[PDB]
Structure formats: C-alpha cells, structure tokens
Amino acid sequence: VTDPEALLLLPRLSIQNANAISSPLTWGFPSPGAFTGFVHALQRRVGISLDIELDGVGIVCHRFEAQISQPAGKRTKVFNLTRNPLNRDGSTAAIVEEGRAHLEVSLLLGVHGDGLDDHPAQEIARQVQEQAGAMRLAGGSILPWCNERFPAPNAELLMLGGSDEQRRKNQRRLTRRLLPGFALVSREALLQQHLETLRTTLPEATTLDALLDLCRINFEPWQVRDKPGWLVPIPAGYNALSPLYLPGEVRNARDRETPLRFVENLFGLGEWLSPHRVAALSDLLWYHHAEPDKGLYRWSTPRFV
Amino acid sequence: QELRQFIESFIQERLQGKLDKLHPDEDDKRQTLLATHRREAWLADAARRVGQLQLVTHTLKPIHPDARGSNLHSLPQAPGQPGLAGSHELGDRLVSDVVGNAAALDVFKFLSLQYQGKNLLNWLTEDSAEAVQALSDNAEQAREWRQAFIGITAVKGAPASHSLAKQLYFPLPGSGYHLLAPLFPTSLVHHVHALLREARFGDAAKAAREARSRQESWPHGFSEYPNLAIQKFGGTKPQNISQLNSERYGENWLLPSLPPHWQRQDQRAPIRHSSVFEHDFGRSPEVSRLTRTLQRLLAKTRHNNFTIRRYRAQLVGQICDEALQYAARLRELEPGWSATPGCQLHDAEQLWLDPLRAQTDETFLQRRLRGDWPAEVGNRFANWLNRAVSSDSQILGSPEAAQWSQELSKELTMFKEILEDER
Amino acid sequence: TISKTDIDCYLQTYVVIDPVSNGWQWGIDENGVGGALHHGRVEMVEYFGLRGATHPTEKEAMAAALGYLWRCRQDLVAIARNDAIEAEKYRAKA
Amino acid sequence: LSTASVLAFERKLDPSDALMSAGAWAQRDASQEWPAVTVREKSVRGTISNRLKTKDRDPAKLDASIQSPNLQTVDVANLPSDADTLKVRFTLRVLGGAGTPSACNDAAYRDKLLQTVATYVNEQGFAELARRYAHNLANARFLWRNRVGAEAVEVRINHIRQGEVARTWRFDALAIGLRDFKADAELDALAELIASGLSGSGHVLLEVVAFARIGDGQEVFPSQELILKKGQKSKTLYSVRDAAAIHSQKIGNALRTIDTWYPDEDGLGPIAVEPYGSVTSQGKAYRQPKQKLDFYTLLDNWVLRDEAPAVEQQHYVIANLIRGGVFGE
Amino acid sequence: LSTASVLAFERKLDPSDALMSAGAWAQRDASQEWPAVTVREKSVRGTISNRLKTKDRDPAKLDASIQSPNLQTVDVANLPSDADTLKVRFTLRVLGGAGTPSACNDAAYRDKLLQTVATYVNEQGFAELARRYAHNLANARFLWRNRVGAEAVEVRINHIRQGEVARTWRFDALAIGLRDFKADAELDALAELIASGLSGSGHVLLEVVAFARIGDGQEVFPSQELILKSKTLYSVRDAAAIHSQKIGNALRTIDTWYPDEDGLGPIAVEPYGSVTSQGKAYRQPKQKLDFYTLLDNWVLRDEAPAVEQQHYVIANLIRGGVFGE
DNA sequence: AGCAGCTGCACC
C-alpha cells in the first residue's frame, strides 16, 4: 500500500438494484470488495490516459433502502424478487433468489499517481465522474441524476497542497460535504482482542463474531449489555482451497490467460463511524492485499489504529 | 453379520412405503416391487448409482441451480494472519454435505444408517465384519460393493464452472490477476444455522427465558439475534441442491450488516416548537435509546472506572454526532422554513438549522448571521443533556460529577468549535 | 399443549422495564430485543414516554406489560406462538 | 471455430424506477410540485370465488365456506378527488458499445463475433431498432395498465447532455399506436440520437415524463411484488421513498417489445425480444428451437458456419445483444 | 383444450370512492361549495345487551347485567343542523374488452375463450347487461343505508367528454324501483352509452352525483372500516366516504336468474352466487348452474347454456378475478 | 438398416 497525493470525492451516488446479499452469511450492505473493484475498473477505463494510479476508496453511505418484506406471523424477513421468462415450451422458471437494495453512497478514493502537477486542476475529477456514471457499483446501475433542482459536483483536494492548518481546514471543509452519512472502517484488532478475552480454556469456532452481532440481555446480578458504536460482520476477502491452476487448464473458465483458484469467503468486523472522529480523511480507504502464494486475498483499511 | 438384520430391516421399511405411496387398485404393478426392491438387486443398483460426491465446503448449486461445475472437499488452510475467519477451521466439526441426483439419495440414506456410527459406514474404510454382511453369498461381490460404495465418495472429474457460477478478478500487487471462482460453504452455513437454532429454541434458552418472564436470577442468560433474513434456495423441492439444503429447507438464515439509520426515514420541520433540543430531538428515534442508557449509566459504581468512564464518554460522543447529523440532514427539506409568519419565531436555534435562508433573505441575514456568531447553541444543548443525569445525592456529593462535567465540557467545546465555522 | 408460559417465554422480549424515579415503568419494544441501543426501537406514547403504569414491583409491571401484549397486540402473540411451536419441535428433534 | 463456452452481454438502454405523482390536467407547464401517490393498506370483505377442490372433504364444510365471507387486506393506490392526471417519470441511459461481449473463453470467437457485428453496423446501421425503441417510448407502453382507459397521454422526452436539457420532444401517445411502425421527422430525430448513443461515442441521458388523464379519483397501478393465513397482506405494492413506482424490468420489457418477425402469425403484435421469444401473458413460446429461428442457432449459424439469416432475424439477433444475456455451452 | 392453470380477468366498470357532503334542497344546481360531512369520534355509555356466556352466569358475577354502563367509544357521522340533503359524488369508468384475459398459460384455451365471447357479442350484444347497470345507476342503490327513509332521492349523471359535460341525466331514484327493470327513453340512452363503452366504441367516464333528502341533523352512514373502538368510519381527507367496492357491489346487483326461488329480487354477480350477509349461497356447485360449470361447458365442450346463463357468465367476466385450476 | 437429438418419464 502507499499514501495518496490527493483525495477525490465523488458525490452522492444513487444505485438502484445493488446486491444486498454480500456473503453466504451476511445480508445488507454490499461487500467493500465491490467498491475496490469498482475503483480498479475505473482505473482501467480512465486512470491510464491521465496517468493516475487509483487505489483505496471510502464508503460513506448516505442512505440505504432494502427491498425486503416481513411476513405476517414471523419475526424474520424475506426478499422481494423479480420474475423470469419461460424456459422452452411455456412454463414458469425456477426462481433465483437475488436481494436488491437501493443505495446512496458517496465515495472518496485515493489519487496517487503523477498525472496532476498544475495544469489539469479540476478536469481529472470531472472526467472520473463522467466515466463513473456509465458503470455499476454492486451489480446495479448508477442513477443518471436528471435535472431536478441543482447538481452535485466532484472534488479533488491535495493533502500536500498547503500547510498544516491548510490541511486541517481543507479536511474540515471536505468532511462537511459527506456529513449525513456513516463511514465504514475495518476492525480486525478489536475482534482479536475479543477472541483473546473470550478464550479462557474454551475454544472458539465462530462465536467471536456472532457474539458481537447478537443482542444479549443476560444477567450479572433485566439489563442489556452494550458496546460502543455499531459493529457489523463484513466479508473481508477470500481464502484459497484449490492448488492454483494453469490458464489453459480449467474448463468453463472466464478467460484462459488468468490463473483460477477455488476460494471461500472471510468474515471480519466493521464500524459505521462519523466523518469527523477519524482524525484524518486519508484513512477510511479500502485497499487490497493479495499474498498470492498463500491465498488470503483480503481487503481492509490499513493505517487506522 | 449382526449388520445383516439391520440391513434387511431397511429394505422392508423402504418397500412398504413404496407400496403404500402408490394408491393401488389395478394393473398388478407391485410384483416388481417384490422382485427388485426386496432382494439384493437393490444393492447392485445402489452400487451402480452415482452422482454423489461427499463434499464439505464447496457447492455450486446455490448459485443458479442449472450450473454444473466442480464441487470440492477440502478445509481451507489455517491462516496465521489474525483478524478474521471464513471457515470452520476450529472445533464443532463438519457435517459432510453431499450433492447429487435426487433419486440417488436413498443410497446415502443407507450409508448414513447409524449402526454404531455413520462416519465408519459412509467412509467405510475400516470395516471387518460388515463385508460379508454386504453380501452373504460370496466374498468377491462383497468387496466389489464395498469399493463401489467407498470409492465414489471421493472423486472429482474435472474443474469447471458452467458459465453461470461466479469468477471475479483480483488485482495482484505488482501487476496481474487471479480468477478467483468462489463456492458456497454449506458445512459452515450448516454450523452457523445450528448455533443460531441452539441459542433460541434450545433447552438453556427456554430455561433462562422463563426466569426473565418472572424477574429472577438463574445460572446464566440468553441472546436474541435480531434482523435475520431467509433466502430459500430450493423452490419447491430442496433435494435437487443438497441433502443439507433439505435438512435446513430453504433457510439460509443470514445475519444483518445494515447501516445504523436504515429503517429511520422521517421528514419533518420544527416550525411549531420554539426549542429544538428539548422537543423533536428526544422525539427522534435513535436519541431516546442513547439518553435512556445514559440515565442507566449515570447511576452506577465507580470502582471499575477505566471501562465505564470510556463507555460514558463514547455515549455522549454519539449524542453530539447525532446532533450534528440532524442539522446536516435538515438541509434537504427546503432552503428556508422560517420566512413564513409563525407563532413561534425561534430564530436562536433556527439560524443553525436554516443556512440557505441567508441566501434568500440576503439583506439582513447576510450581516446578522455573520455578525452575531451563534455559539451559545451548544449551551442550550448542555441544559438538555443535564437532564440525562439521575437526581441522586450520592453521585452528586462525590467528585465523579466533576469528571462528568469535565468530559461533557470538553466534548461540548469540540461541538462549539465545529459550530463556529459554519458560515 | 402449549401453555401461556411457553408463549410468554418468547413474548417477553417485546417489553422493556425501566426503573424511574417513582417506580418501574414499562413499554413495548417493536424489534423484540428488550429495547436495546443499536438494534432495537421502543415505541413512545404521546409528553413523551413509555406506555406503562408506574408499578412499584417489577413483577407487577412485567405482568401488566405481558397482559397488555396478550390483550391488545395479537400479532406479537402470533409471532410468540409461531416461535413456541418450534421451541418444542426442536426438543422433539433433539 | 468452436463455440465460446461462456458468453455474456451487459444491458444497454438502461431504464429506471418511474415515480408517479398526481395532479390536474392543463397544469402540465408548471408540473414540478406535484404530490406523489402513496400506497395504502385497506381491508376488504368478499366472497369465496375460487373454484373448490372436492377431495377428502365433506360438502357441508365447503358449503359453509362459500356462505361465509372472505376477509383480506390488500394494498391500493388511487389519485385524490382533485387530481385526474397521473405523471410517470423515469430516466433512460443509453450506454454504447452494443456488440462487444463482457465474457468470452476464446479469442477466435470474440474476433469473429466483432467482425460480424462490424459488418452489421456497416451495412445496416441502428435505424430499424432505434426507430422501434423510439416508437416504444413514443407510445406509453411503460404505463401498462394506466393506458387501457386513459383518454389522452402526453409524453415529453428531454435530452440532458451535460447538466441541462438540449432538445425536447412532445408526443401524443395514442395516435402512435401499439401496433404500427411509421416514420415521422421528430421520431427519426430521436432514433438518430439513440443510434448515436448505441455506437460507443457517448452514453446519452433521456428523461421521460408521461401525463395520463385517467379519471377524477380513479385507480392507478404500480407494480406488484413477488413474495413466494390471518392478518397477512395478499397484495403488496411497490413504493420507493414513500412514492408509488413501477419496476425497471417492467419498463424494460415495455420498451423492448419490438419483435414483429416470428414464424407463427406475426400480425398479432410486437412481442418481447427474448431467446425462445416468449410472452408470459400468453404462455406461448414463439421462436421455438424445433423451428430454426431461435437466437442461439441463428447466432452460431451466423458466426461459426458463415451462413446468414435474412435482414429481420439478424435485427432480432442484434437486438438480443443490445438487451443482454448469459449464454454458453 | 383443458382449462388453464392461470386465468386472470381485469375489472371493467371501475368506480371511485364516493365522497359525502351536505347542504339544503333547492340548491342542488349550485352544489359545488358544499361542506364535507366529518366523522366525529364520540363516547357512549350503554348497558349489556348481549347474551350471557357460560362463565358470566355465576351468582356473584351476575352483576354484569346489573352494574355495567359498558363505556364504549365509536365513530358517528351526522348532518349539520340547517342542512337536510346529503350529496354523494363519484366517478365511474367503463373500459371495454370484456372477454380478453390478462394472464394465461394455454393459448389454445385462450383462442377458444375469445371465440366463445365473440360468438356471444355477435349474437347477444351488451344490451341487457348495460340496461341493468344503467338501472342500478338510475336509482341510488349506491346509497346503501342512506336511501332507506329519504323523502326525495335524485341522481344526476354527467358525461365527461374532454373535461366538461357532454350529456346530463336527471333521474328520480324513488320512481324507479329497486327490484324491477323497467323501460325509459333516457335510461335507454344511458344504456346505449354504457354498451358503447363496454363494447369498445368509445371511452366512457361518467360523473354520478346523488342527493338524498334525509332531514336536519340526522345520522348519515359512510362505510365502516374492516380491522384485522370497534367502530371506525371511513374518510379520505377529513371527509366521510363510501368505499368503491360497495359502490361497485351496488351496480353489480343485476342477477335475476338463479336456481333458487328468484321471485325475491336481484343479487350480486358472484361465482357460487353468495349473499354472505343473508348466510345463503345460491348457485351452489351441486346443481349445475354456477359459473365454473357453465364456463367449462361453453368453452371446452361447446355446450352452450341458456341465454340468461350466458348473460350471467359475461357479467362474471366483466367483474373479473382469478379463474383456473 | 445404423447414429444423434429430443421428449416423456421415474424418483426424491
């Protein structure tokens, strides 16, 4: 990973049908790996012509509306589906369960390369905003934002462009532009602390995460025990099962010039903070970390704590 | 050879149900049910019947059920990097999922016939007396049927993902990509669902809920697991996907990763009430459980101060966070909601809540909003937050109230500092 | 053979019992978690506050909450009965 | 040489959820402050009108059932008593890069496929298909059930280029019927814009509003959800941000019904563009694979055996590539 | 040839929620600014008028009939004290396309059904059904409990052609009875217009207003809400209203052909034609005269029933619903 | 008079 030379703020992005299913176990907000893959794809489309390497992305989540329904007579929830066409003779197909959610999230990503010196001072942000619109973020199209009252412009702020009080003033002015939302950060050390204090001659299997995910009203002589903040299980990358295959070896591949690996998910913690208690907006940025010989294709926010 | 009586029981209990679920009145069809499904030609066809694989954490049928790729049996390698967990690389061992044809699952039901354990019978590598129980006529076809049963439960074929499974690129550090085709971890989704079923419908939860209905003590407590969701893989018959998808019919039992404010849509303007901290702030949906927990926490013991003072400080930090977000989201209603003639003027708090009103009334508000410096609006907030304390002389007499005033004054100083540069 | 206490096992989590300066007020919780901070939402009666009488003892306020749940809000009792059937079906399994 | 084992095409002509509001006619000039219609759960008392299954029962129980009322709770949404005009608004994003796939195993199949789509767009540009899509937007085919009794529908389409409009079109949706495909000047201009947007140079933004004069306080219909016995809502209506709306797939199927070349009495009407072209309202799957006119056999007869269908079936194949899909053997 | 698993039919003759206002007689012409009848919640103090249960008949608990004011709270809608005329206004849209389903799984059954309905409309047009719908408009059966003692009821029907009136009918609901279908010239003109709308030769949206002269201060009856207080009246925008399904049930009472002793009166059109408020279901499936047997004999087996049964079948198709396996 | 595709069917 590396440190950004500038931060690019894409404003309030509206996604119509995102993938609310983010794991084999967690539903709700999409995986942040979708956002990191979006910024990598946006680097492949528009980052090469400007000579900018685009890594690290923030997630602020202005609003979230999941297309779910609670059935009358049950506590749990089910998904509102869409209907599929007929197969071959006239017959209703087998329905595939896909969760959909309307999202509004603005992004802050890390401009890192050597493409801005003094001349294209604001054109880089506008070109990245005009290329981000005709793409997808979690499987759903980004809304075009037709004319209602007034648009929402892009932003490009250079953290090296100014003194220390200029850094704090520009960070305070930027962090007010994403204020109705909640930033998502990754907390691996906190989950390891909970595993340390919990494992007192009793072994864990997965209870360290489902115990922070539940709400217990247990009694210590009711009372309901509480935590600071909102701690949600999020899919933190993949893990390897298969010894890796040659590009032209596995049949029914997506392409025969990239090696295939059968992978499983991973699960870690995440917190939904405010934009004004992180002490640096150069954090919140979600990066990859491969280590390809072992597996552990992970994504996380480094340099946080 | 004591397995043989247990064997000939099961074929009879199968064939009786096959005769009963036919509604027979004519056509003399039952004779073949006496011919094949009573003798051991059933065993020859059970040796013939394949499609089953005995997987653990790899199914491709939950992702678009008309897709035939590769299904695996391997626990993932134990990671040394701390912070996460993705499989059951620990205790509470696997449940041995099997994917195959739905007509062939009677063979697995015969393998899992728990004659002193189904692990030494489904993976029957260590059998000594069971061989002649499989065929009490010879020793050749007995070994043949043993090899045909235990050999087909570990076989692969070829790696595939039949154009409807998922496979997504992963950017490498320097340059390059890996293809990264994932699978559904049915043993892990079985184990999580079994824990969530044990925490609610179990005996311990039934015992410890009866004590709470009666306000008691008891050895221990319990949990709730809110906002679960159901994702039903099989449409009407779940036997096509997996046997574990039939034991947990549909029933993915997913856990919530939602934002905090997700089910909190409300659009209102405080045109009626004068003071906005006392009214419509406590009437907000999320602030009430912060304030009531603060009243619950501001009357307690101060012996273990290192954790409870941190929790008491973070619970006030969240309150001023929601206080700033309220003014942040009230700028989406209208540029001005105070220019109309109203019974309550309330400009002292509405100068904070109507910033674009100065863009409309650019004559007097442009001088007055930048000449008056509204920074006592946090002092009005502190008078509302002082009612979150309990009226007890024991906490009022000690010095911990000075500590509470110290942390509240620090966080309100940060609040006033943020509110000063609002122009 | 599902008694009222078996339904009352799973009906109890929709109420909350707050000790106040005079006594033990009670209220109704929508999410069925006991009125927690992060996951729950407790309905407030219109003055804003809990919809409960100020009972002296906690057993009295708990019985008042649970009797009002059985009397007025029958969908919560239906959810509690749908949980209580599986609560003994799970014992019938294992 | 051999067929590509995977094949995928992303969806172009992207629709959106269409918000619905209410308001009076002859106020369509300042029709920007209209209140949106909301969904309302009302409870109804009816009769047992479903046909009975007389199996393992007695006639007394089913007779006492059909003598007893049926108590349901449904969700409806109607205009107010001072509003007879429904306003349906959505956004269309015509992307570009029509015949470029998004997944391919082989380089040979991708090369030959881009060659045949190149010869298509050279020898016959997007002129029939763009006119058909612009006609499907010209009539209010997206207003599915709100058009069966509307007296007049006025459709305004605005072209938003950078931050504002640049071209307005105003159609009467009942003169341009649901079956005829004629040629007008403004419709050919809109087809030229959609044709320029489908070729990769830009992704064009259209905003469509539709005024339908339904009736004073009558019933409007948003789309129903697919959820797979006392106090349960039988009919649930779609509403996003507390405003009633139609799905995106319904609007996509509405402005995608342009296929008028199918081998079993094609004069009944335009049907949806689909592999094994199916109308779920009719239950009958035209373009049967027993006949030689499905999308799959025509596509691999075009790109692997170098034969060619007529001018119409390759228009159908290109329209299926515009729609999108997941294929592969 | 067999019956489809899914068969859906859309509702023609769609009315609106009928809204109520109040004023004086001889101001029927300028009755545009009339004030809306408001539902008021009141509390009453009664007695115990129900029969005692097996548990409440004890000697020490017989006080329920003795000492119980019973303390109820209900909703009530009344007229203002200087107004004796109640005005009920709604709009009625008639669509056309009576026999075309909106969903089907077998198109051979669909072509058979379309051929059968076209055979009907070619032989027997929409002359009886439109006459019966027009007679259910011409008397105010839409005013359900608001007609049972009124001194003078007058209905007025306007044709909304573009935005304004094209034709005005002014009928006396007390001269036209509630149990016989007679003849009149203006009623026949309204029947021709309704038949032209139902056949598909035009778009018909009518404005139906109805004045019932109850008297000053009297109790008017809007629709009562079904709750899945115990008395909640229906109101849209703080004005008491009748539901559109009750108004549509008032115009669906056209069935004077059923297997019972049909010298009593017309009933509503239902499959297994049911008056659940009277507890008896005529057109039982045991006698071969319900909608499903006639529809499966007319379409599948080409066994055409009598012309009155064809009228009832086409009326049940106009009502719409879910028919199928 | 012998192959490959299709369709109905059996079972859970």
Automatic annotation (TrEMBL), chain A:
NCBIfam families: cas_Csy2 (TIGR02565)
Protein name: Uncharacterized protein
Organism: Pseudomonas aeruginosa
TrEMBL record, chain B:
Natural source organism: Pseudomonas aeruginosa
InterPro entries referenced in this protein's UniProt entry, alphabetically: CRISPR-assoc_prot_Csy1 (IPR013397)
Domain of life: Bacteria
Protein name: Uncharacterized protein
